């Protein structure tokens, strides 16, 4: 696998036309705000095709 390429797998809402978003902030799918660390339903938002 080549892991250099990434796509955003999770976001709070859809991008507007030509909106662009670098942000690596932890995605809260869970009940509790994630304090900037990974956990159960506290996901890192960018994932590789590999």
């Amino acid at each position: 696998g080549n892991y250099n390429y990434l796509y955003r797998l999770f976001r709070k809402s859809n991008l507007k036309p030509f909106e662009r978003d670098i942000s690596t902030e932890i995605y809260q799918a869970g009940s509790t705000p994630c304090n900037g660390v990974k956990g159960f339903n506290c996901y890192f938002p960018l994932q590789s095709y590999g």
Binding site: K16, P17, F18, R20
Partner: protein
């Protein structure tokens, strides 16, 4: 760092409009002389397009330099 763009070109009122629809950030402007009054002038004016800048970002806050 990260300058995606760079450019060089109370009696005065300078007017501007900033708009951020779809691709990139539109700016319009005008100048007119005015009487020395704290309120805006009653005579009509219209602002002319300048640029559509490669900033790529939402914008939410701003300030003036004296």
């Amino acid at each position: 760092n990260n300058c995606t763009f760079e450019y060089v070109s109370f009696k005065n009122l300078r007017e501007f409009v900033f708009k951020n629809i779809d691709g990139y950030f539109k700016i319009y402007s005008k100048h007119t002389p005015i009487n020395l009054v704290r309120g805006l002038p009653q005579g009509f004016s219209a602002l002319e397009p300048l640029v559509d800048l490669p900033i790529g970002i939402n914008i939410t806050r701003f300030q003036t330099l004296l």
